[PDB]
Design a protein around this ligand. Structure first.
Ligand SMILES: CN1Cc2cc(S(=O)(=O)N3CCCC3)ccc2NC1=O
Length: 127
């Protein structure tokens, strides 16, 4: 009963960049989702141990969560916005794959994904 190491949030060898799109992702997209009533189960890596989901990391081999995304943004881990958008999508997809439809957690992810899509609809053109 161990969790895996969480996804990296910094890497000495990975080129780093600030873009206006990455700024929007932190200041508008992540900020909006982070403070949502349904954010909290997504604010850190899935703790398969504490949540008693022993098969979680047998099924989900590409874990992701908003805690991780938040640190990546803050750390300037990403080169581009598409990397960050991909992380959000992974987090939602993992949830839909692992959990039963009608579980509360699935309803929560669906609400946050709708808001995410609303906010990324207006991602500004890059400068
Ligand atoms: C992302 N999660 C975390 C999670 C949390 C929890 S719970 O029991 O904390 N809970 C019930 C709904 C609100 C939060 C249960 C399952 C998952 N599955 C994931 O897919």
């Amino acid at each position: 009963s161990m969790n895996p190491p969480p996804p990296e949030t910094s890497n000495p060898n990975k080129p780093k960049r600030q873009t206006n799109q990455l700024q929007y992702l932190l200041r508008v997209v992540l900020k909006t989702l982070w403070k949502h009533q349904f954010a909290w189960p997504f604010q850190q890596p899935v703790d398969a141990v504490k949540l008693n989901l022993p098969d979680y990391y047998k099924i989900i081999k590409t874990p992701m969560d908003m805690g991780t995304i938040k640190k990546r943004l803050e750390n300037n881990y990403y080169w581009n916005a598409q990397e960050c958008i991909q992380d959000f999508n992974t987090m939602f997809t993992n949830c839909y794959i692992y959990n039963k439809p009608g579980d509360d957690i699935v309803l929560m992810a669906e609400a946050l994904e709708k808001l995410f899509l609303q906010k990324i609809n207006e991602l500004p053109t890059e400068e």
